[PDB]
Design a protein around this ligand. Structure first.
Ligand SMILES: OC[C@H]1O[C@H](O[C@H]2[C@H](O)[C@@H](O)[C@@H](O)O[C@@H]2CO)[C@H](O)[C@@H](O)[C@@H]1O
Ligand SMILES: [Ca+2]
Ligand SMILES: [Ca+2]
Ligand SMILES: [Zn+2]
Ligand SMILES: [Zn+2]
Ligand SMILES: [Zn+2]
Ligand SMILES: [Zn+2]
Ligand SMILES: [Zn+2]
Length: 467
């Protein structure tokens, strides 16, 4: 077990202020002898639920509150025990974010929202509207520069624009999310995405741009604007690029609705140090002195500790962050939330690459989120289709569903709640895509006219040998 006794192990996403948390670590060793080890695994949002299945993994996991409901469902999270004294010390807004089934399942740390960052030297007046940007780009290209570059590979980043004209994740009727009602296929969503597809088509943005491309492009000086969070400031500051942080553009008059996220720290249900951890977080990290350590390394954003948030909220950058939170909505923490993220991730990618039409793409994003769970084994993958597609109570027969290319003959288990596909990867895949580090296998599940994309990533070191 990573988790030993008398020793703390923390997992935090690589982009956050990990070394600064390490300083808050060492200040906890010099006071208690308990060593704190902080590490930053890749895809750690996905690594955590696998290892902690078997009691493995860290004592404390740091991530945006949205994944924690899923974690807690699968019984991999400790319920935290903070007293009345402490609960008053953070913003109620943030406690409610870390709650699930009426239990607190993590400690809220900071509030994050995507603002629009811009180069005052290249563009002393940011655009107020999305519709301005194509034009703006032309003029800018003529000067050897570009208008806007941001991470098109994650959904987090393109959502503010989809939601804008009335996209949403899961409908919230009567204080409960209807998990069969996804607002990714509606007209407002189609509007947002189409506009974004055209930016790509008109060479105003490239479909390939990812987090590290966009970040360099801007920090070098090659792009006017970018979309990103508080954590990206640390670097921008270093490039000495003269920048400001303002409200995201509007679309069809309406504002961009970023998802607001609450950086939360969660205690492992299998950890033998649940009290030592409880102490680290409550009295060393969640303090005016401790938060400063991290926020110094990589800005946390609008920190949830009332105390320091107030001392800090006189920053125009956080000022913008908060304005954008306002026009946002907050992330659901339900389990299905990660199916959503995958659905949409694929949709955007397929639309922007022309693999699917925006209509078909977002049509699929619905079924995928509402009724599909994909699970990728070594040389076979498992596709679990919920029998009731959209809540109708009208179930489908196994003959309505079709997986992979023609030669793909999967074994079909059929319960009364699901229909299960167990399929031979190589034999069923419709296309494999090689990247510097990854291999993505892709195939389609058809139902009705609709085609939902089934998609499995692996690293490229699985070739050596026998795939
Ligand atoms: O892209 C989907 C992804 O978005 C969010 O993750 C954010 C995270 O919240 C940010 O703080 C930052 O680290 O960038 C991430 C996006 O690349 C969700 O929290 C996550 O569950 C979701 O999969
Ligand atoms: Ca829908
Ligand atoms: Ca720093
Ligand atoms: Zn790392
Ligand atoms: Zn144009
Ligand atoms: Zn083969
Ligand atoms: Zn292998
Ligand atoms: Zn062989």
């Amino acid at each position: 077990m990573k988790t030993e006794e008398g020793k703390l192990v923390i997992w935090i996403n690589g982009d956050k202020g990990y070394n600064g948390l390490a300083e808050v670590g060492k200040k906890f060793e010099k006071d208690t002898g308990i060593k704190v080890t902080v590490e930053h695994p890749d895809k750690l949002e996905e690594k955590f639920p696998q290892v902690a299945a078997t009691g493995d993994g860290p004592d404390i996991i740091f991530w945006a509150h949205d994944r924690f409901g899923g974690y807690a469902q699968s019984g991999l999270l400790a319920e935290i025990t903070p007293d009345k004294a402490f609960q008053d010390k953070l913003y109620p807004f943030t406690w409610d974010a870390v709650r699930y089934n009426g239990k607190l399942i993590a400690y809220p740390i900071a509030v994050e929202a995507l603002s629009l960052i811009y180069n005052k030297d290249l563009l002393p007046n940011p655009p107020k509207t999305w519709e301005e940007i194509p034009a703006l780009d032309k003029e800018l290209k003529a000067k050897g520069k570009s208008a806007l570059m941001f991470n098109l590979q994650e959904p987090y980043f393109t959502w503010p624009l989809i939601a804008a004209d009335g996209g949403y994740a899961f409908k919230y009727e009567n204080g409960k999310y209807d998990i069969k009602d996804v607002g990714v296929d509606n007209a407002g969503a189609k509007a947002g995405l189409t506009f974004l597809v055209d930016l790509i088509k008109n060479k105003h943005m490239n479909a390939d741009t990812d987090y590290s491309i966009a970040e360099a492009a801007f920090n070098k000086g090659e792009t006017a604007m970018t979309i990103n969070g508080p954590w990206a400031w640390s670097n921008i500051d270093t490039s000495k690029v003269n920048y400001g942080v303002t409200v995201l553009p509007t679309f069809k008059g309406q504002p961009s609705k970023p998802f607001v996220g609450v950086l939360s720290a969660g205690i492992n249900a299998a950890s033998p140090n649940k009290e030592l951890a409880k102490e680290f977080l409550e009295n060393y990290l969640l303090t005016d002195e401790g938060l400063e350590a991290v926020n110094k390394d990589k800005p946390l954003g609008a920190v949830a500790l009332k105390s320091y948030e107030e001392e800090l909220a006189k920053d125009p950058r956080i000022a913008a962050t908060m304005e954008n939170a306002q026009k946002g909505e907050i992330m659901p923490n339900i389990p299905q939330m990660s199916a959503f993220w995958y659905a949409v991730r694929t949709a955007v990618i397929n639309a922007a690459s022309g693999r699917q039409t925006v209509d078909a793409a977002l049509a699929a994003a619905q079924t995928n989120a509402a009724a599909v769970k994909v699970e990728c084994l070594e040389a076979e993958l498992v596709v679990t289709v919920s029998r009731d597609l959209f809540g109708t109570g009208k179930l489908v027969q196994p003959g309505d569903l079709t997986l992979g290319s023609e030669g793909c003959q999967p074994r079909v288990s059929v319960d009364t709640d699901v229909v299960r596909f167990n399929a031979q990867l190589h034999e069923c895949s419709s296309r494999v895509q090689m990247t510097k580090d990854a291999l993505v296998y892709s195939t389609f599940l058809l139902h009705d006219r609709v085609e939902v994309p089934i998609e499995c990533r692996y690293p490229r070191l699985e070739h050596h040998h026998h795939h």
